[PDB]
Amino acid sequence: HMTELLKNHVAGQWIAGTGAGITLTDPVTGVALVRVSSEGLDLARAFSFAREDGGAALRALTYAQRAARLADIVKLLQAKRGDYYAIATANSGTTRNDSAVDIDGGIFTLSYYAKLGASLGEVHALRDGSAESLSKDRSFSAQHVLSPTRGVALFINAFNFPSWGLWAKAAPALLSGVPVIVKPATATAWLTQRMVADVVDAGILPPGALSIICGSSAGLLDQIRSFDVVSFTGSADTAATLRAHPAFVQRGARLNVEADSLNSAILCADATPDTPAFDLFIKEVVREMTVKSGQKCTAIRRAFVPEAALEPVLEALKAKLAKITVGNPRNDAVRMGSLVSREQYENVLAGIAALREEAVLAYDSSAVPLIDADANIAACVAPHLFVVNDPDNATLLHDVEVFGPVASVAPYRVTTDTALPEAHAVALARRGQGSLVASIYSNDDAHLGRLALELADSHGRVHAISPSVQHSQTGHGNVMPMSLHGGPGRAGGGEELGGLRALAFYHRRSAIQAASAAIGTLTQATHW
Amino acid sequence: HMTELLKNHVAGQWIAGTGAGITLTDPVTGVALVRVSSEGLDLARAFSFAREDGGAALRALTYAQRAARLADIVKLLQAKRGDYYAIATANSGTTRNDSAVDIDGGIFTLSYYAKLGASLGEVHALRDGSAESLSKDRSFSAQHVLSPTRGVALFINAFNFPSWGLWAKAAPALLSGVPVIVKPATATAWLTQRMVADVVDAGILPPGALSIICGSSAGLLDQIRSFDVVSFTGSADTAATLRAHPAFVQRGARLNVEADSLNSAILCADATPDTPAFDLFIKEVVREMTVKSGQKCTAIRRAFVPEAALEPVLEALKAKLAKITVGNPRNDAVRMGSLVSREQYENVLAGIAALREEAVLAYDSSAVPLIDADANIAACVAPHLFVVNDPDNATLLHDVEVFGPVASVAPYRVTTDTNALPEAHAVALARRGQGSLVASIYSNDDAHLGRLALELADSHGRVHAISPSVQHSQTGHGNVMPMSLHGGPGRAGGGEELGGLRALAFYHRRSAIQAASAAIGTLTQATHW
């Protein structure tokens, strides 16, 4: 008698992998929860049934018909949230509020796209921009269109967001008429598989539209062909092995990468310790370090503050981090639970030791006993705050991501000649080699507009926090589905979400050049 | 004693490669024209100078200032057209009309982007779409923007369009504030290098803004970094080697590929021999086979016609092809010149032999004496027309690209029941090409063309519909209009360029700015939508 072996959904059937499988475990208590395996699956059939049946059946439906099916999946996921929260507590060791970022974040984003999708109407292709004359008499004209790619969407998803990573990607893919095969990271795969099971069991989507494989990834990319698309989230080192696969180098399948990102937070010159913007910065830093134990891809890793503001910053961060209780998320006194696994705990400990070689530890509450948890079993890590006094000559600050409740503060030299006062901090943020997000904090709303444009070429999102929006700003690390998610360089060169922008990744663009009456008839069969 | 060694323009200086260089030759007369070499250049310095010095200088200008420079380049190149035509005749062996496709096509495209860019105004970044609320009280909002990438643009460009390949890419890159390094194909590099030399001599752009290397490619991709962009045009096998380079696999630099493309022309069921659409189809196929001797990436390689039309179609094609005179483009009686080189002459001839294993050669004017040219020296290939009677079972038809005045005609089975379009089978057959830059379609019925077009759109980057109402205005199967997307999925590479403003995205970095509505206000005043 062993724990449940979770089956895969492939070629319209629930199939168990062979062998003993891989055990998922509770990262707080060490209890064995469920097992996964992909051993022995027929991956040629899995990919063909999705691509041929799943794709033809989705393409038969209009956008608005697909959107209505996403609305029904929203209602189903909401009705089962109690089950999802139980699995999150056990498999991920997250506080209820932190579980919500993944569960309800996923559902909210799915709902956003169901609503947006309803507006795309009862058509099978979309218009890109308007018609343009190609002739003096306007008898011959051109109109670009977007048509769903005749392939499958493979999602290789990270362990931190088993729900959101599924729905953030699946919602625009299914809206686009493209069938989904999700491969969630093993350690936290249970929620992804239960949600897929719930949806598949309800029969909302056609057969073949949504498939799941949990276990080994071996042989998956071998099945990818030129009209397929892949979206990978995970380590930069893995990313580079993936990109060398023949699916991409020889077959040219489209790829999106999200990888390591040393996201920055920049305290502006004007945000001194007497001003309201100073506290907003302290709070935002501590929230990003601690939500999910710092396991968001978008968490603040590097915090750049004026030389003069360095000691007051460290003191204020020390005091706010001290209120952070760590342990078992079942106890309501706990503010921050565990990392996802004891294996991740070891990578985080190892990252911490590596940073320590070039930074001073300003804060670490590792001697505080855990609440309702044994430190020798649980994958709990206490917040750790590093200070790097010389970031220009810094070796590791800008290059080593520690995927845990860890961040480094560094001073920058204020520019008070005339450019931006924050010019040095922009330069230091850029040394992270391209990131998902930077946030900037100031009392002056107008100044944040100027500064933002200086970070925009190296960050997929610039998030500006100031007293006028203390009540409304949506958070450094919280990804709003109407806004772009991705970043250049190190962060992977990828783009997803950004509302309608997400649909392009799933379609083929074409310029149609024709008699005006032909363009008129095309336009009658399309929408934007 | 030796022909001119063309210098490279790198790190703001004219530098000769070392060594004897590679000789470029006239593909009609065999005359040695000029030499190139990249041997010994300091590539790190060439790329670093363009990236910092060139990039900083271009980003300092506004979109409208950059566009004004492009408009200055237009007038310069227009002044110099005489020199450009003499180079094209000698290096490429093309007729005046065909040389115009590369020279005046490039100038036209540059000029189009110059006009486009002047509308973008005195700003340094663009808005992507409108502002959008992130909060119930609208105090916090989001606006996406596009900002030039802090990189270089490297163009590894094909032998067929030394001018248009440079300008169609350079125009959106320089409008976007991105310095350009162009590496033109060796065999026909001369025109590219002369146009770059004229523009750099003229002092129109900042130093570092436009560089050129001609000769060996070795070591160029090694200099590419994560914020640079690369646009390659060439064979699929060369593209594959290129995609594997650390520049893309490790560093994630953006890559656009244009590769082999077996573009289709489809005659609709209603375009029978007694209707005006039929002659438009015959004319278009012949024009595509013969312009530049078939050496456009976009040329029709596969022509699909109803079973009933197969004989009248071969008969009409042979008729029209027989009028195509071949030889020295210096002679006003010649309608088609040569291929770019004797090496391409051999490759095309190998391709013809490969296709003949599975196809019947229906027309071949190989024995017709050349005009003012020696067949043992020149690279003149006559038109060849293949017929494949069973395209469903054919292999080579749908997979083998012969980059010369060659095409294959195949019948399809008209579908006679109204679940489907009559051209259903021809659509399936076009798709067997595994993704192409363009398909054209021919009918008397304009409405019908609009429906058919949507059926080809997910496998073709452009669908080009020709009918009697646009006999006088349609812009040509193969001719690339800069306002329309150029590229295609699958075998054709998965690339996208041109498409008017759409071309700018490849050179920019897109970002969501989320801020108080006042900040969104101030970045809005500094940007153009």
Side-chain angles (χ1 to χ4, degrees):
Chain A
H1 309 227
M2 282 178 256
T3 50
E4 191 186 354
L5 168 73
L6 299 184
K7 303 188 166 74
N8 312 291
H9 192 72
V10 281
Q13 308 179 323
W14 289 105
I15 305 295
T18 60
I22 303 150
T23 304
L24 279 60
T25 60
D26 180 319
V28 173
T29 62
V31 165
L33 299 170
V34 294
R35 299 174 285 135
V36 291
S37 173
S38 59
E39 302 303 298
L41 294 182
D42 181 344
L43 302 173
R45 274 209 73 238
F47 280 66
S48 89
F49 184 81
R51 190 174 304 107
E52 300 302 310
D53 293 72
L58 286 165
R59 286 188 312 269
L61 302 168
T62 55
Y63 296 90
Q65 289 173 326
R66 300 192 292 262
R69 281 170 177 70
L70 302 183
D72 288 335
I73 298 174
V74 175
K75 292 179 179 129
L76 170 65
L77 297 175
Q78 306 180 306
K80 290 171 174 305
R81 287 166 67 250
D83 298 333
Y84 299 147
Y85 275 86
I87 284 168
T89 301
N91 194 5
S92 289
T94 38
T95 71
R96 168 117 184 150
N97 280 5
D98 286 348
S99 290
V101 177
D102 187 39
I103 303 160
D104 300 340
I107 300 173
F108 178 81
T109 296
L110 185 62
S111 192
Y112 169 71
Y113 275 92
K115 293 186 191 155
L116 197 62
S119 77
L120 301 178
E122 306 280 347
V123 304
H124 298 97
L126 300 178
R127 287 190 307 275
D128 178 339
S130 47
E132 263 194 65
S133 185
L134 288 166
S135 53
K136 192 86 212 318
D137 65 358
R138 307 188 85 83
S139 65
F140 193 69
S141 299
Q143 173 60 72
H144 297 77
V145 299
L146 294 167
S147 305
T149 192
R150 279 182 188 237
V152 297
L154 173 67
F155 297 154
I156 294 165
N157 286 354
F159 65 71
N160 57 350
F161 283 119
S163 161
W164 176 83
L166 170 57
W167 295 120
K169 296 181 192 190
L174 288 174
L175 180 55
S176 292
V178 173
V180 166
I181 296 165
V182 56
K183 204 299 182 167
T186 292
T188 60
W190 194 13
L191 182 56
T192 308
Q193 192 273 353
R194 175 64 68 82
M195 281 177 162
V196 172
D198 292 341
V199 166
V200 170
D201 289 350
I204 286 155
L205 296 173
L210 176 53
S211 301
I212 183 169
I213 294 170
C214 299
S216 173
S217 304
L220 294 175
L221 294 182
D222 285 358
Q223 293 305 322
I224 289 291
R225 293 173 174 0
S226 67
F227 290 80
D228 291 342
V229 305
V230 179
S231 170
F232 169 86
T233 310
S235 96
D237 56 35
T238 306
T241 294
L242 193 127
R243 288 210 187 85
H245 193 285
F248 312 110
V249 304
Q250 290 175 16
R251 310 186 297 263
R254 297 208 169 128
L255 173 66
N256 198 261
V257 174
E258 294 167 1
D260 302 3
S261 181
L262 284 90
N263 307 293
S264 289
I266 289 166
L267 183 64
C268 285
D270 71 277
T272 53
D274 41 11
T275 67
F278 188 89
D279 198 44
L280 296 177
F281 168 81
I282 301 304
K283 282 201 182 134
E284 201 68 16
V285 175
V286 165
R287 193 172 134 225
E288 295 295 326
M289 284 172 78
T290 60
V291 165
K292 304 169 50 70
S293 299
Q295 298 164 299
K296 300 202 309 289
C297 294
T298 46
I300 291 160
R301 313 296 185 186
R302 296 186 294 149
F304 293 114
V305 299
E307 285 172 310
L310 184 68
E311 320 237 75
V313 163
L314 298 178
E315 303 288 290
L317 293 168
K318 279 165 56 182
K320 213 152 292 327
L321 292 161
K323 296 179 181 292
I324 304 293
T325 46
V326 182
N328 199 328
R330 298 165 185 77
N331 188 308
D332 292 344
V334 166
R335 292 297 195 263
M336 184 171 82
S338 62
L339 294 168
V340 296
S341 66
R342 192 67 188 192
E343 282 89 352
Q344 281 296 315
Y345 161 99
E346 292 305 337
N347 298 129
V348 170
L349 285 193
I352 289 163
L355 295 194
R356 213 176 167 165
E357 307 223 289
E358 146 198 302
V360 172
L361 205 44
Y363 182 93
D364 171 7
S365 61
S366 285
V368 176
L370 292 177
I371 301 177
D372 293 346
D374 176 351
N376 305 326
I377 297 169
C380 290
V381 169
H384 291 230
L385 187 73
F386 284 99
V387 193
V388 173
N389 285 110
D390 191 5
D392 278 355
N393 294 126
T395 40
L396 296 177
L397 174 65
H398 307 295
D399 296 314
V400 176
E401 189 192 58
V402 183
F403 206 75
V406 177
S408 301
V409 194
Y412 68 93
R413 285 174 229 109
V414 178
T415 297
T416 179
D417 217 31
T418 47
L420 284 170
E422 290 81 21
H424 184 203
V426 178
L428 290 168
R430 192 173 291 161
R431 284 200 56 190
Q433 308 284 251
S435 307
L436 297 182
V437 63
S439 45
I440 48 173
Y441 305 74
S442 177
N443 299 288
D444 189 331
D445 286 353
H447 184 64
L448 293 170
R450 290 181 278 133
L451 183 53
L453 297 172
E454 282 287 282
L455 289 152
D457 64 24
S458 60
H459 294 73
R461 179 163 54 91
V462 178
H463 190 268
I465 287 161
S466 49
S468 74
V469 296
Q470 68 154 29
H471 66 294
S472 54
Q473 63 98 358
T474 52
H476 175 277
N478 296 325
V479 173
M480 303 297 95
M482 56 270 306
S483 291
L484 179 73
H485 179 71
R490 179 178 277 144
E495 289 189 34
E496 66 162 290
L497 299 168
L500 299 163
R501 295 171 185 80
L503 301 177
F505 184 69
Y506 302 99
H507 286 74
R508 301 291 159 181
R509 190 175 327 264
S510 196
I512 316 303
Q513 298 191 337
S516 270
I519 303 299
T521 116
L522 289 155
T523 73
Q524 295 184 346
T526 53
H527 187 79
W528 189 263
Chain B
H1 50 320
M2 289 171 300
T3 47
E4 186 180 1
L5 182 64
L6 302 183
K7 299 178 157 62
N8 304 298
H9 192 64
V10 281
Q13 291 174 315
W14 289 105
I15 309 295
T18 65
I22 300 140
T23 296
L24 284 58
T25 63
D26 186 312
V28 176
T29 64
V31 167
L33 298 171
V34 293
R35 292 174 298 126
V36 295
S37 182
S38 65
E39 300 306 288
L41 293 174
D42 183 345
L43 303 176
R45 176 150 64 146
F47 278 70
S48 77
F49 187 89
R51 205 177 296 112
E52 351 266 14
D53 305 67
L58 283 168
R59 283 190 307 275
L61 299 169
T62 66
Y63 293 90
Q65 286 172 322
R66 290 202 297 265
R69 291 170 165 66
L70 301 180
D72 280 348
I73 293 167
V74 168
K75 303 183 177 166
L76 174 65
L77 289 178
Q78 293 183 142
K80 291 180 187 276
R81 276 164 73 253
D83 292 345
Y84 305 154
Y85 273 92
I87 294 170
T89 299
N91 191 7
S92 288
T94 49
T95 62
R96 181 137 188 133
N97 287 359
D98 286 353
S99 294
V101 182
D102 184 33
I103 295 160
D104 290 334
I107 291 173
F108 182 85
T109 295
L110 176 60
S111 185
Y112 164 72
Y113 277 96
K115 290 167 186 160
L116 208 58
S119 77
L120 294 177
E122 300 292 338
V123 304
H124 288 97
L126 303 180
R127 299 193 247 117
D128 164 3
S130 52
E132 158 152 34
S133 187
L134 302 172
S135 47
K136 181 30 115 207
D137 69 0
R138 311 168 62 80
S139 55
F140 197 68
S141 289
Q143 171 67 62
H144 293 78
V145 298
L146 291 160
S147 303
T149 196
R150 283 173 175 262
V152 298
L154 172 59
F155 309 146
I156 298 176
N157 279 359
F159 62 69
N160 57 349
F161 279 117
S163 164
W164 176 87
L166 159 69
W167 299 112
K169 299 179 187 191
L174 290 180
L175 180 53
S176 287
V178 182
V180 166
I181 299 167
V182 53
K183 206 272 174 191
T186 292
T188 56
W190 187 17
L191 184 53
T192 308
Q193 191 268 358
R194 171 67 64 84
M195 287 177 149
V196 171
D198 287 343
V199 165
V200 165
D201 284 350
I204 290 161
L205 303 170
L210 183 55
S211 302
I212 188 178
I213 301 177
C214 305
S216 177
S217 292
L220 285 177
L221 296 175
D222 280 358
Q223 287 307 323
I224 292 289
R225 294 177 167 8
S226 70
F227 293 89
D228 296 344
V229 309
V230 179
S231 181
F232 173 80
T233 303
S235 76
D237 285 355
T238 298
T241 302
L242 180 146
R243 286 217 196 75
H245 195 282
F248 311 109
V249 307
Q250 309 204 41
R251 309 193 282 273
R254 307 197 164 139
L255 179 58
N256 198 253
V257 171
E258 291 166 5
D260 303 356
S261 186
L262 292 308
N263 310 292
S264 293
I266 296 168
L267 187 66
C268 284
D270 74 275
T272 54
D274 56 312
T275 71
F278 183 92
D279 193 51
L280 305 175
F281 171 81
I282 304 299
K283 282 184 167 167
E284 203 68 9
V285 171
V286 168
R287 187 155 133 224
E288 289 299 322
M289 285 171 77
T290 60
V291 169
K292 300 173 54 63
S293 299
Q295 290 167 304
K296 307 202 304 285
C297 296
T298 51
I300 292 171
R301 312 300 188 187
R302 301 180 291 150
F304 294 118
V305 302
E307 280 169 311
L310 185 60
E311 299 304 302
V313 160
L314 299 168
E315 299 305 306
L317 289 168
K318 292 192 264 245
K320 194 142 338 284
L321 290 165
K323 291 167 185 287
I324 306 294
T325 48
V326 181
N328 193 325
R330 294 156 189 89
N331 196 302
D332 276 17
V334 164
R335 316 264 215 278
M336 192 168 82
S338 71
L339 302 166
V340 297
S341 63
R342 183 78 185 189
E343 190 172 348
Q344 279 306 295
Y345 168 90
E346 293 298 339
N347 290 160
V348 165
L349 287 196
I352 287 164
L355 288 184
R356 203 169 181 176
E357 288 297 281
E358 307 298 338
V360 172
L361 187 57
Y363 179 96
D364 171 1
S365 64
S366 288
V368 170
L370 303 171
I371 291 158
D372 287 343
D374 184 340
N376 298 325
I377 290 175
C380 287
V381 174
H384 296 231
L385 185 69
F386 286 97
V387 175
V388 173
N389 301 117
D390 188 4
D392 281 349
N393 301 120
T395 37
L396 314 181
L397 180 52
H398 303 294
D399 303 309
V400 185
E401 189 187 60
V402 176
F403 204 76
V406 186
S408 312
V409 194
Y412 67 91
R413 293 186 220 95
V414 175
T415 299
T416 196
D417 279 72
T418 49
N419 225 341
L421 302 185
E423 294 84 15
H425 188 204
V427 177
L429 288 172
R431 283 183 190 137
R432 297 272 307 266
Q434 309 278 280
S436 302
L437 302 171
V438 57
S440 51
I441 45 176
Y442 306 68
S443 181
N444 302 286
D445 180 343
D446 282 358
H448 188 64
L449 296 163
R451 316 177 221 130
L452 176 59
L454 289 168
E455 286 288 292
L456 293 158
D458 65 22
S459 61
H460 296 80
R462 189 153 56 77
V463 178
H464 186 271
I466 291 168
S467 52
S469 81
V470 300
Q471 60 178 8
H472 68 300
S473 56
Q474 68 96 355
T475 48
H477 174 272
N479 295 325
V480 178
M481 296 295 297
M483 49 283 289
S484 293
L485 178 73
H486 179 73
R491 178 171 286 152
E496 295 193 21
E497 70 163 286
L498 294 166
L501 291 158
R502 294 176 186 78
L504 303 195
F506 187 70
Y507 305 98
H508 291 69
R509 292 293 153 182
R510 186 183 276 96
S511 191
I513 306 311
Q514 309 186 325
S517 288
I520 293 311
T522 104
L523 68 95
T524 51
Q525 297 167 341
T527 53
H528 178 271
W529 178 196

